[PDB]
């Protein structure tokens, strides 16, 4: 799910950027260090809103490092997964263990135990696919996956989904 | 160039990545090219400030 | 060479706060540990790799 | 602020609308004013992200079908974004291929439509992100909706959503 | 060389809170249970599993890793075990304090 | 921010202290040694500490000293406005 | 294995430097080895070729001189043991106490 | 049959395996001999007890004795409690045999190694089916 | 307090009393290996953005 969240970060600037245009460097650092990053607390931080109105607080020089630490307050859009959520995605890859969909910046793993009984793995077909009487699941296919569990690390998030429930699976 | 066996000289060269090179055993690869931001551990020279103490 | 308590007091009198830290940390044992925000114990299993 | 030791925290589950300790319904902005949680459906998120990117492009220089649109977003994303944009590139590609409402007019109506239900911000975003044909499908796909909106209102809301979306 | 890079934020200690370990906290904090009074196995080649020098508790040898964090000696801070005492025992440093508390409260209803 | 005393009601001394001068010179010397933009013209100087002393003399050190108070309140004093008489 | 970084050139086939040879810092004076139990690898570098570990007695790092005498005999238990004496000349300099 | 938990120090730059490693004990560093890159720093060189791994295996024990201040009543009961240990009883038999071997060897004016070999020989050949119907005196003499 | 005398007895009392140490004195910071709020450490050095633009 996508949210607009208020976030704060501590950015450290090397003294080489302690010039008249240091504010621009901090803004550049925020894009290069926040956008495209993953955090288990706020999820995947995608885009920074109001890039021109980022609040930069006074910088504190670290005693030994000599670099200035800046507290930066910004507004950004974050994709945070949840257990029990229903999402749609594309099957990036398939294997014996299962097939995983590509939902936004995240990948949801669908285990065989989380799949319906009828579906069976078939490695003879190129590319490998799960075939059943009603539908066939292959790379690039569209699947409606329900997240059955999420593990969030400080800089990584992994989720597992199921398609056993009704109105799930191939779209 | 002087090395750790001739004062004034140096004993180690530390790169920006944290890797430290011991000038002993390092001459096999010829000279080393220093770069800005690196650290060179060199022998204490004249006029260097040091702390001088006597106990108790 | 020991940097004893009496030596620490003199540096405190001199006001060299940064030098005192340098002697006690960079010139001697220095260790980095991970602590939990809920409990202030060094019981965090960190897989740095 | 003193009892920092472990307390039993509710599990993060969407079915119970327990989004965690940080995604609560009430949120505080940087100024300090109380604000509601901002949940965006797929269509709304695409517009918000794109609206920021286009503004970002203007700042630097100053100082349609899915196929061609996908290319248009691709070129814009690279120009107006820095390195390590792997996650963002996939996000924009996913949003375009899965978004249902294209422009602001349709998106604005959708917001003008579902806010009358008074549901949780997470629930309304789910309704605008997942296409459901019958009340039962929405109820099972979004368990939180159960015992919150009657099938009579839900059936008409989904029908109006389908008639407000064109490609 | 120095210690490896870590993604966790770096801060400075601002307050130290003392206290006493609860029996539950010790078990939760502990990474392994010690049940053998030996230190090395019968072969005296590798430390016995479940013994005092359990590999899960950490490592003090420059050539061995920690079975918990898979990190070297200079990086592993050490991990705590726990021993389940058959019967409760007094804390030698709190015997005097325990005596004072016992007099303060009733020995039948604890009031 | 109730701990930031306004500039109009600052009651601390307007003179730089020896510890403040020592840290400012050392703080800026480290930055110079790490390739920081020097704001003062150099007539020939290689020691970072000597460069910092030149900057302090001409008041070209872009730093402010946050003087803390025993209750937690602080006052921000710019190096340029601090009198260096000691 | 674990051979000291010093030099073993001055040692003889018996691991002892003969009298009259000049010695300096880190020079091994008494060469000794002990068998090592297999299944122990340190820093790699431990192949099937290695079967011993160094247990030598090097000269003091700050001291140098010439080996005076070397006597070989047995202790009360009959085990082999040796004594090595080294001569060096001390000349008055700045910092000598009189 | 168990986790590796083995670390091999190789130079990332030189990449030559096996590497030439020199241990600078005085500098406390492990440095590559070809390029000089340091692979490990802060190398480490009574708060312990003298333990013999072979003749005693893995057996750790502590004695109870008087201190600067102590009441005789506490010492006696604690020693009595310590003796009544079922698990330590099994190892005490080997220790008791070692004590008698020590007495016999000492009374014979024999070298220390002879006593050590006799104790080790008893331990290796004790607790075996073949030697169960033989007097302990013959067992000790044969080991000596 | 433990740095002076009765180190273990004081620490046990703090544990029973659940004492909170704010780490203001030299002894606390010296134990923790961080700059104490003394002399040069009695203040914070910050970067002035208003002045950076005016020095060029
Ligand atoms: Zn914790
Ligand atoms: Zn470990
Ligand atoms: Zn190398």
Short mmCIF file of N, CA, C and O in Angstrom, two decimals, chain H residues 16-106:
data_model
loop_
_atom_site.label_atom_id
_atom_site.label_comp_id
_atom_site.label_asym_id
_atom_site.label_seq_id
_atom_site.Cartn_x
_atom_site.Cartn_y
_atom_site.Cartn_z
N UNK H 16 46.24 -14.42 -4.64
CA UNK H 16 47.04 -15.64 -4.73
C UNK H 16 46.68 -16.54 -3.55
O UNK H 16 46.73 -16.11 -2.39
N UNK H 17 46.30 -17.78 -3.84
CA UNK H 17 45.91 -18.75 -2.82
C UNK H 17 46.72 -20.02 -3.03
O UNK H 17 46.71 -20.58 -4.14
N UNK H 18 47.44 -20.52 -2.00
CA UNK H 18 47.55 -19.95 -0.65
C UNK H 18 48.41 -18.69 -0.62
O UNK H 18 49.28 -18.54 -1.47
N UNK H 19 48.16 -17.80 0.33
CA UNK H 19 48.91 -16.54 0.39
C UNK H 19 50.16 -16.63 1.26
O UNK H 19 50.30 -17.52 2.10
N UNK H 20 51.06 -15.68 1.04
CA UNK H 20 52.24 -15.51 1.88
C UNK H 20 51.88 -14.53 2.99
O UNK H 20 51.67 -13.34 2.73
N UNK H 21 51.82 -15.03 4.22
CA UNK H 21 51.36 -14.25 5.37
C UNK H 21 52.52 -14.12 6.35
O UNK H 21 53.15 -15.12 6.71
N UNK H 22 52.78 -12.89 6.79
CA UNK H 22 53.80 -12.60 7.78
C UNK H 22 53.12 -11.97 8.99
O UNK H 22 52.37 -11.00 8.86
N UNK H 23 53.38 -12.54 10.17
CA UNK H 23 52.77 -12.08 11.42
C UNK H 23 53.75 -11.14 12.12
O UNK H 23 54.74 -11.58 12.70
N UNK H 24 53.46 -9.84 12.05
CA UNK H 24 54.26 -8.83 12.73
C UNK H 24 53.81 -8.77 14.18
O UNK H 24 52.94 -7.97 14.56
N UNK H 25 54.40 -9.63 15.02
CA UNK H 25 53.99 -9.71 16.42
C UNK H 25 54.22 -8.38 17.13
O UNK H 25 53.36 -7.91 17.89
N UNK H 26 55.38 -7.76 16.90
CA UNK H 26 55.67 -6.49 17.55
C UNK H 26 54.66 -5.42 17.16
O UNK H 26 54.19 -4.65 18.00
N UNK H 27 54.31 -5.36 15.87
CA UNK H 27 53.30 -4.43 15.40
C UNK H 27 51.88 -4.95 15.59
O UNK H 27 50.93 -4.20 15.38
N UNK H 28 51.72 -6.22 15.96
CA UNK H 28 50.39 -6.77 16.16
C UNK H 28 49.54 -6.75 14.91
O UNK H 28 48.35 -6.42 14.98
N UNK H 29 50.12 -7.09 13.76
CA UNK H 29 49.43 -7.03 12.49
C UNK H 29 49.67 -8.31 11.71
O UNK H 29 50.69 -8.98 11.87
N UNK H 30 48.71 -8.64 10.85
CA UNK H 30 48.85 -9.70 9.86
C UNK H 30 48.83 -9.04 8.49
O UNK H 30 47.81 -8.48 8.08
N UNK H 31 49.95 -9.12 7.78
CA UNK H 31 50.17 -8.34 6.57
C UNK H 31 50.52 -9.27 5.42
O UNK H 31 51.26 -10.25 5.60
N UNK H 32 49.98 -8.97 4.24
CA UNK H 32 50.33 -9.71 3.04
C UNK H 32 51.79 -9.46 2.69
O UNK H 32 52.25 -8.32 2.68
N UNK H 33 52.52 -10.54 2.40
CA UNK H 33 53.95 -10.42 2.13
C UNK H 33 54.24 -9.85 0.75
O UNK H 33 55.34 -9.33 0.52
N UNK H 34 53.29 -9.93 -0.18
CA UNK H 34 53.52 -9.48 -1.55
C UNK H 34 53.23 -8.00 -1.73
O UNK H 34 54.04 -7.28 -2.32
N UNK H 35 52.08 -7.52 -1.23
CA UNK H 35 51.68 -6.13 -1.42
C UNK H 35 51.74 -5.30 -0.15
O UNK H 35 51.73 -4.07 -0.25
N UNK H 36 51.82 -5.92 1.02
CA UNK H 36 51.86 -5.19 2.27
C UNK H 36 50.51 -4.82 2.85
O UNK H 36 50.47 -4.17 3.90
N UNK H 37 49.42 -5.20 2.20
CA UNK H 37 48.10 -4.93 2.75
C UNK H 37 47.91 -5.68 4.06
O UNK H 37 48.26 -6.85 4.18
N UNK H 38 47.36 -4.98 5.05
CA UNK H 38 47.13 -5.56 6.37
C UNK H 38 45.79 -6.28 6.35
O UNK H 38 44.75 -5.69 6.04
N UNK H 39 45.81 -7.57 6.69
CA UNK H 39 44.60 -8.39 6.68
C UNK H 39 43.89 -8.42 8.02
O UNK H 39 42.67 -8.63 8.05
N UNK H 40 44.61 -8.21 9.12
CA UNK H 40 43.99 -8.21 10.45
C UNK H 40 44.88 -7.42 11.40
O UNK H 40 46.10 -7.64 11.43
N UNK H 41 44.27 -6.52 12.15
CA UNK H 41 44.97 -5.68 13.12
C UNK H 41 44.49 -6.01 14.53
O UNK H 41 43.63 -6.86 14.74
N UNK H 42 45.07 -5.30 15.51
CA UNK H 42 44.72 -5.49 16.91
C UNK H 42 44.88 -6.95 17.33
O UNK H 42 44.06 -7.50 18.07
N UNK H 43 45.95 -7.58 16.86
CA UNK H 43 46.23 -8.96 17.22
C UNK H 43 46.56 -9.06 18.71
O UNK H 43 47.26 -8.22 19.27
N UNK H 44 46.05 -10.12 19.35
CA UNK H 44 46.28 -10.35 20.77
C UNK H 44 47.46 -11.30 20.92
O UNK H 44 47.70 -12.18 20.09
N UNK H 45 48.21 -11.12 22.01
CA UNK H 45 49.37 -11.96 22.30
C UNK H 45 48.93 -13.39 22.57
O UNK H 45 48.57 -13.74 23.70
N UNK H 46 47.05 -14.14 38.87
CA UNK H 46 46.69 -15.10 37.84
C UNK H 46 45.18 -15.16 37.68
O UNK H 46 44.44 -15.11 38.67
N UNK H 47 44.71 -15.28 36.44
CA UNK H 47 43.29 -15.30 36.14
C UNK H 47 42.94 -16.61 35.44
O UNK H 47 42.01 -16.68 34.63
N UNK H 48 43.69 -17.67 35.75
CA UNK H 48 43.50 -18.96 35.12
C UNK H 48 43.95 -20.07 36.04
O UNK H 48 44.42 -19.83 37.15
N UNK H 49 43.80 -21.30 35.55
CA UNK H 49 44.15 -22.49 36.32
C UNK H 49 44.93 -23.45 35.43
O UNK H 49 44.68 -23.54 34.23
N UNK H 50 45.87 -24.17 36.04
CA UNK H 50 46.66 -25.14 35.30
C UNK H 50 45.88 -26.43 35.12
O UNK H 50 45.52 -27.11 36.08
N UNK H 51 45.62 -26.78 33.86
CA UNK H 51 44.81 -27.94 33.53
C UNK H 51 45.59 -28.85 32.58
O UNK H 51 46.28 -28.36 31.68
N UNK H 52 45.47 -30.16 32.80
CA UNK H 52 46.12 -31.15 31.96
C UNK H 52 45.07 -31.85 31.11
O UNK H 52 44.18 -32.52 31.66
N UNK H 53 45.11 -31.72 29.78
CA UNK H 53 43.98 -32.23 28.98
C UNK H 53 43.91 -33.74 28.89
O UNK H 53 42.81 -34.30 28.77
N UNK H 54 45.05 -34.44 28.95
CA UNK H 54 45.07 -35.87 28.65
C UNK H 54 44.80 -36.72 29.89
O UNK H 54 43.83 -37.49 29.91
N UNK H 55 45.63 -36.61 30.92
CA UNK H 55 45.50 -37.47 32.08
C UNK H 55 44.22 -37.21 32.86
O UNK H 55 43.78 -38.09 33.62
N UNK H 56 43.62 -36.03 32.71
CA UNK H 56 42.39 -35.69 33.42
C UNK H 56 41.21 -35.45 32.48
O UNK H 56 40.10 -35.22 32.97
N UNK H 57 41.42 -35.50 31.17
CA UNK H 57 40.32 -35.25 30.25
C UNK H 57 39.74 -33.87 30.47
O UNK H 57 40.46 -32.87 30.55
N UNK H 58 38.42 -33.81 30.58
CA UNK H 58 37.69 -32.56 30.83
C UNK H 58 36.98 -32.71 32.18
O UNK H 58 35.82 -33.10 32.24
N UNK H 59 37.69 -32.38 33.25
CA UNK H 59 37.15 -32.45 34.61
C UNK H 59 37.58 -31.20 35.35
O UNK H 59 38.77 -30.99 35.57
N UNK H 60 36.61 -30.38 35.74
CA UNK H 60 36.85 -29.13 36.45
C UNK H 60 36.30 -29.23 37.86
O UNK H 60 35.12 -29.57 38.05
N UNK H 61 37.14 -28.94 38.85
CA UNK H 61 36.73 -29.04 40.25
C UNK H 61 37.41 -27.94 41.05
O UNK H 61 38.45 -27.41 40.65
N UNK H 62 36.80 -27.60 42.18
CA UNK H 62 37.32 -26.58 43.07
C UNK H 62 37.27 -27.10 44.50
O UNK H 62 36.37 -27.87 44.86
N UNK H 63 38.23 -26.68 45.31
CA UNK H 63 38.32 -27.09 46.70
C UNK H 63 37.78 -25.99 47.61
O UNK H 63 37.76 -24.81 47.25
N UNK H 64 37.35 -26.40 48.80
CA UNK H 64 36.81 -25.50 49.81
C UNK H 64 37.78 -25.47 50.98
O UNK H 64 38.11 -26.52 51.54
N UNK H 65 38.23 -24.27 51.34
CA UNK H 65 39.21 -24.12 52.40
C UNK H 65 38.95 -22.87 53.21
O UNK H 65 38.13 -22.02 52.85
N UNK H 66 39.68 -22.76 54.31
CA UNK H 66 39.53 -21.63 55.21
C UNK H 66 40.13 -20.37 54.60
O UNK H 66 41.00 -20.42 53.73
N UNK H 67 39.64 -19.22 55.07
CA UNK H 67 40.15 -17.94 54.64
C UNK H 67 40.70 -17.13 55.80
O UNK H 67 41.00 -17.69 56.86
N UNK H 68 40.82 -15.81 55.62
CA UNK H 68 41.30 -14.97 56.71
C UNK H 68 40.34 -15.01 57.89
O UNK H 68 40.77 -15.01 59.05
N UNK H 69 39.04 -15.05 57.62
CA UNK H 69 38.02 -15.19 58.65
C UNK H 69 37.05 -16.28 58.21
O UNK H 69 36.56 -16.26 57.08
N UNK H 70 36.78 -17.23 59.10
CA UNK H 70 35.92 -18.35 58.77
C UNK H 70 35.59 -19.13 60.04
O UNK H 70 36.44 -19.26 60.92
N UNK H 71 34.36 -19.63 60.12
CA UNK H 71 33.94 -20.48 61.22
C UNK H 71 34.11 -21.94 60.82
O UNK H 71 33.71 -22.34 59.72
N UNK H 72 34.70 -22.73 61.72
CA UNK H 72 34.99 -24.12 61.40
C UNK H 72 33.73 -24.90 61.07
O UNK H 72 33.78 -25.90 60.34
N UNK H 73 32.58 -24.48 61.60
CA UNK H 73 31.34 -25.22 61.38
C UNK H 73 30.97 -25.26 59.90
O UNK H 73 30.56 -26.31 59.38
N UNK H 74 31.11 -24.13 59.20
CA UNK H 74 30.73 -24.08 57.79
C UNK H 74 31.64 -24.94 56.92
O UNK H 74 31.16 -25.59 55.99
N UNK H 75 32.94 -24.94 57.21
CA UNK H 75 33.87 -25.68 56.36
C UNK H 75 33.58 -27.17 56.37
O UNK H 75 33.62 -27.83 55.33
N UNK H 76 33.29 -27.73 57.55
CA UNK H 76 33.12 -29.18 57.66
C UNK H 76 31.90 -29.65 56.86
O UNK H 76 31.98 -30.62 56.10
N UNK H 77 30.77 -28.97 57.03
CA UNK H 77 29.55 -29.40 56.35
C UNK H 77 29.69 -29.28 54.84
O UNK H 77 29.24 -30.16 54.09
N UNK H 78 30.31 -28.20 54.36
CA UNK H 78 30.48 -28.02 52.92
C UNK H 78 31.33 -29.12 52.32
O UNK H 78 31.02 -29.65 51.25
N UNK H 79 32.42 -29.49 53.00
CA UNK H 79 33.25 -30.59 52.52
C UNK H 79 32.46 -31.90 52.50
O UNK H 79 32.58 -32.69 51.56
N UNK H 80 31.65 -32.13 53.54
CA UNK H 80 30.82 -33.33 53.57
C UNK H 80 29.85 -33.35 52.40
O UNK H 80 29.66 -34.39 51.76
N UNK H 81 29.22 -32.21 52.11
CA UNK H 81 28.28 -32.15 50.99
C UNK H 81 28.99 -32.39 49.67
O UNK H 81 28.46 -33.08 48.79
N UNK H 82 30.19 -31.83 49.50
CA UNK H 82 30.91 -31.98 48.24
C UNK H 82 31.24 -33.44 47.97
O UNK H 82 31.14 -33.91 46.83
N UNK H 83 31.65 -34.18 49.00
CA UNK H 83 32.03 -35.57 48.80
C UNK H 83 30.89 -36.43 48.28
O UNK H 83 31.12 -37.35 47.49
N UNK H 84 29.67 -36.15 48.71
CA UNK H 84 28.51 -36.96 48.32
C UNK H 84 27.98 -36.47 46.97
O UNK H 84 26.89 -35.89 46.85
N UNK H 85 28.77 -36.72 45.94
CA UNK H 85 28.41 -36.42 44.56
C UNK H 85 28.48 -37.70 43.74
O UNK H 85 29.52 -38.35 43.68
N UNK H 86 27.36 -38.05 43.10
CA UNK H 86 27.31 -39.29 42.33
C UNK H 86 28.14 -39.18 41.06
O UNK H 86 28.86 -40.12 40.70
N UNK H 87 28.06 -38.06 40.35
CA UNK H 87 28.78 -37.90 39.09
C UNK H 87 30.29 -37.81 39.29
O UNK H 87 31.04 -38.42 38.52
N UNK H 88 30.75 -37.07 40.30
CA UNK H 88 32.18 -36.97 40.56
C UNK H 88 32.76 -38.24 41.15
O UNK H 88 33.99 -38.39 41.16
N UNK H 89 31.92 -39.16 41.63
CA UNK H 89 32.43 -40.40 42.21
C UNK H 89 33.17 -41.23 41.18
O UNK H 89 34.22 -41.82 41.47
N UNK H 90 32.64 -41.30 39.95
CA UNK H 90 33.25 -42.14 38.93
C UNK H 90 34.67 -41.70 38.62
O UNK H 90 35.58 -42.53 38.51
N UNK H 91 34.88 -40.39 38.48
CA UNK H 91 36.22 -39.88 38.19
C UNK H 91 37.15 -39.97 39.39
O UNK H 91 38.37 -40.04 39.21
N UNK H 92 36.60 -39.97 40.61
CA UNK H 92 37.45 -40.07 41.79
C UNK H 92 38.21 -41.39 41.82
O UNK H 92 39.35 -41.43 42.32
N UNK H 93 37.62 -42.46 41.30
CA UNK H 93 38.32 -43.74 41.28
C UNK H 93 39.59 -43.66 40.46
O UNK H 93 40.64 -44.16 40.87
N UNK H 94 39.53 -43.02 39.28
CA UNK H 94 40.73 -42.84 38.48
C UNK H 94 41.72 -41.95 39.21
O UNK H 94 42.93 -42.22 39.22
N UNK H 95 41.24 -40.87 39.83
CA UNK H 95 42.12 -40.00 40.60
C UNK H 95 42.74 -40.75 41.77
O UNK H 95 43.92 -40.57 42.07
N UNK H 96 41.95 -41.58 42.45
CA UNK H 96 42.48 -42.37 43.55
C UNK H 96 43.59 -43.30 43.07
O UNK H 96 44.62 -43.45 43.73
N UNK H 97 43.38 -43.95 41.92
CA UNK H 97 44.43 -44.78 41.34
C UNK H 97 45.66 -43.96 41.00
O UNK H 97 46.79 -44.40 41.22
N UNK H 98 45.45 -42.75 40.46
CA UNK H 98 46.58 -41.87 40.17
C UNK H 98 47.35 -41.53 41.44
O UNK H 98 48.59 -41.50 41.44
N UNK H 99 46.64 -41.26 42.53
CA UNK H 99 47.31 -40.93 43.79
C UNK H 99 48.18 -42.09 44.26
O UNK H 99 49.32 -41.87 44.70
N UNK H 100 47.67 -43.32 44.18
CA UNK H 100 48.47 -44.47 44.58
C UNK H 100 49.64 -44.70 43.62
O UNK H 100 50.73 -45.08 44.06
N UNK H 101 49.43 -44.47 42.32
CA UNK H 101 50.54 -44.55 41.38
C UNK H 101 51.60 -43.52 41.73
O UNK H 101 52.81 -43.80 41.68
N UNK H 102 51.18 -42.30 42.07
CA UNK H 102 52.13 -41.26 42.46
C UNK H 102 52.92 -41.68 43.70
O UNK H 102 54.14 -41.49 43.76
N UNK H 103 52.24 -42.26 44.69
CA UNK H 103 52.94 -42.69 45.90
C UNK H 103 53.96 -43.78 45.59
O UNK H 103 55.09 -43.74 46.09
N UNK H 104 53.58 -44.76 44.76
CA UNK H 104 54.51 -45.83 44.41
C UNK H 104 55.70 -45.30 43.63
O UNK H 104 56.85 -45.65 43.93
N UNK H 105 55.45 -44.45 42.64
CA UNK H 105 56.54 -43.90 41.84
C UNK H 105 57.44 -43.01 42.69
O UNK H 105 58.67 -43.07 42.57
N UNK H 106 56.85 -42.17 43.54
CA UNK H 106 57.66 -41.30 44.39
C UNK H 106 58.53 -42.10 45.34
O UNK H 106 59.71 -41.78 45.55
#
